[PDB]
Design a protein around this nucleic acid. Sequence first.
RNA 1: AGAAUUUGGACAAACUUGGUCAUUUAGAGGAACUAAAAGGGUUUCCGUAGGUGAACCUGCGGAA
Length: 137
Amino acid sequence: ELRTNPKFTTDPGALQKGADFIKAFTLGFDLDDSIALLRLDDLYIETFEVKDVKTLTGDHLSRAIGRIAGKDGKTKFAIENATRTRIVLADSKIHILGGFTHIRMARESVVSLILGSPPGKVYGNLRTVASRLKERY
RNA sequence: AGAAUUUGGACAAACUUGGUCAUUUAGAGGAACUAAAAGGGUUUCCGUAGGUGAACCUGCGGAA
């Protein structure tokens, strides 16, 4: 429970930022990863399910979670580093933390992994988006 | 019962020898044909068995 103290609280948004902090820890993000929300003002969490992308069931759903994660989490590790985001893959529930354009690119990468795009095309696209994001022009 | 041994009649192994058939092979010539080679189950927890400072790790079964 969080409550605004009018005699002490001064920022009108503090309640929402504190609540958005608390949810990030709830969703599964590490604490130091959750502190970025309080510290920064342009970090957004993107949340969605595998079923939203495609109605997969049984082993088809399990393979989809595998394709997103990859062996030893390599594919998930690559997506977070290329897009400069933080991803929590809780079964079929995905939570992506980062900047707007950043999580927009991570979302496309995850969806392509769900829908079955070839691994090479995803990895190659991860190379390009990694560089293109950091460039001034 | 077998005889040693003898006369004569057939069966007949094996050997020498002149032929005639079939099969291999030796050199030496004659002549014909062909060939020839540089460059896809991660994260946080729960239960259990084992190890284990039951800290922690591994196997299995569950939840987000």
